[PDB]
Scaffold this active site. Sequence first.
Site, mmCIF file in Angstrom:
data_model
loop_
_atom_site.group_PDB
_atom_site.id
_atom_site.type_symbol
_atom_site.label_atom_id
_atom_site.label_comp_id
_atom_site.label_asym_id
_atom_site.label_seq_id
_atom_site.Cartn_x
_atom_site.Cartn_y
_atom_site.Cartn_z
ATOM 1 N N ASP A 85 0.866 3.081 4.809
ATOM 2 C CA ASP A 85 -0.663 3.789 3.938
ATOM 3 C C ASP A 85 -1.301 4.578 4.548
ATOM 4 O O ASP A 85 -1.460 5.625 4.436
ATOM 5 C CB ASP A 85 -0.366 2.590 2.874
ATOM 6 C CG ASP A 85 -0.723 1.311 3.226
ATOM 7 O OD1 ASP A 85 -0.897 1.610 5.091
ATOM 8 O OD2 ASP A 85 -1.332 0.417 3.064
ATOM 9 N N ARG A 89 -5.475 0.222 -7.716
ATOM 10 C CA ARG A 89 -3.773 1.245 -6.466
ATOM 11 C C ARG A 89 -3.254 2.017 -7.668
ATOM 12 O O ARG A 89 -2.768 2.662 -7.181
ATOM 13 C CB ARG A 89 -2.375 -0.137 -6.521
ATOM 14 C CG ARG A 89 -3.382 -1.369 -5.124
ATOM 15 C CD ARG A 89 -2.221 -2.102 -5.398
ATOM 16 N NE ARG A 89 -2.212 -3.371 -4.370
ATOM 17 C CZ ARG A 89 -2.177 -3.385 -3.139
ATOM 18 N NH1 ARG A 89 -2.047 -2.434 -2.398
ATOM 19 N NH2 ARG A 89 -2.063 -4.976 -2.511
ATOM 20 N N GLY A 136 0.280 -1.668 0.152
ATOM 21 C CA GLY A 136 0.567 0.481 -0.311
ATOM 22 C C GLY A 136 0.584 1.258 0.025
ATOM 23 O O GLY A 136 -0.235 1.812 -0.525
ATOM 24 N N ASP A 178 -5.163 2.642 11.227
ATOM 25 C CA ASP A 178 -6.288 2.801 11.571
ATOM 26 C C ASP A 178 -6.828 2.116 12.842
ATOM 27 O O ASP A 178 -6.126 2.330 14.116
ATOM 28 C CB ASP A 178 -7.549 2.039 11.290
ATOM 29 C CG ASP A 178 -7.064 0.705 10.013
ATOM 30 O OD1 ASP A 178 -6.326 -0.438 11.416
ATOM 31 O OD2 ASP A 178 -6.659 0.515 8.536
ATOM 32 N N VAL A 224 -11.261 3.684 1.321
ATOM 33 C CA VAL A 224 -10.976 3.790 0.567
ATOM 34 C C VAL A 224 -9.555 3.400 0.519
ATOM 35 O O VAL A 224 -9.330 1.737 0.131
ATOM 36 C CB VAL A 224 -9.917 4.984 1.431
ATOM 37 C CG1 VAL A 224 -10.938 6.383 2.131
ATOM 38 C CG2 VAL A 224 -8.966 4.303 2.337
ATOM 39 N N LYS A 283 -7.031 7.020 10.186
ATOM 40 C CA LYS A 283 -8.620 6.575 10.286
ATOM 41 C C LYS A 283 -8.790 6.502 11.903
ATOM 42 O O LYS A 283 -7.999 5.525 12.601
ATOM 43 C CB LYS A 283 -9.068 5.646 10.366
ATOM 44 C CG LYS A 283 -9.432 5.461 8.815
ATOM 45 C CD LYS A 283 -10.042 4.143 8.241
ATOM 46 C CE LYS A 283 -10.619 4.120 7.063
ATOM 47 N NZ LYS A 283 -11.263 2.485 6.665
#
Lengths: 166, 166
Positions: free
Chosen positions: B89, B154, B45, B92, B142, B120
């Site tokens: 990336d 991606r 990511g 969360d 997302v 997040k």
Amino acid sequence: GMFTPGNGPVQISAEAIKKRVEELGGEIARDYQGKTPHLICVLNGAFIFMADLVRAIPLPLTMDFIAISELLKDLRLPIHGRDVIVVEDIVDTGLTLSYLLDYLEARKPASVRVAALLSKPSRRQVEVPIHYLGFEIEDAYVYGYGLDRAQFDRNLPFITSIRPEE
Amino acid sequence: GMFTPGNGPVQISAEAIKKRVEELGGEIARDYQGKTPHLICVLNGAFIFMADLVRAIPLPLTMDFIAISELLKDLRLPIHGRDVIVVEDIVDTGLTLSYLLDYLEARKPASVRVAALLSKPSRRQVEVPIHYLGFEIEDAYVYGYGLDRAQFDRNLPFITSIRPEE
């Protein structure tokens, strides 16, 4: 700002690279219309080329990363039946790419093409194909744009080089 | 052209990302003046964020790639005594980053800071630091700019999202 080019004979600006990468992305998008390619980035050197190139290909696609030098890092996504595109930083002897191609062909992909930022044809020891080439260059010590100089300088936004003496 | 954003509540343009990444690169360059950081990209990511960020840091630096989900891919360069910068990336729950930080601290680096494109905070399950943050967002699905949607997308040059229903 502090990015400084070496004194070598090879010099490719960030702008020249940007334009060339967008042209390559365009060709891939065209050639693969109606398909879903699987792009495999050869770490570590091709990661920046990969990042700019994928953003220039308006097609649904998947990707993976492999590190080879002897397989250093292995694939995670299947390639059998996939239209694979190898993304290389530089092809000189062609030995590494040749191994990789044999390794991928073993899994029976639907097809395989190669995208490479740089090519030093004078160093070829084996015949390998390059379908999407950024630039063809002389056998100079190059670095920048993902390529390193003793692990340093991969962050240079342009491709530069040093003289043989140094 | 064919890049299309989802119908979700989170939308960040390629331009907004570009500007934010350059600001972060500037801060890092400033904070690390006189030093040589070692940036570790969390695959898969963060690879695009990593590519744009390093080109925005005018300092001599080295880098490495690690894949975690359980350590999927291991480091190759030493970190003991190095000023390390983790490049994430998205943060969360903070569970993955927390593990990674403990893993790196075990090798006794000179220091460690974290650079993350997205955060997040409402999903936090453990306290983790983020010294260089791109954007703070709500808990929406997302993708784009390196982040995937079932391995696809991606390659979107922007960050987008989908609605909970879909």
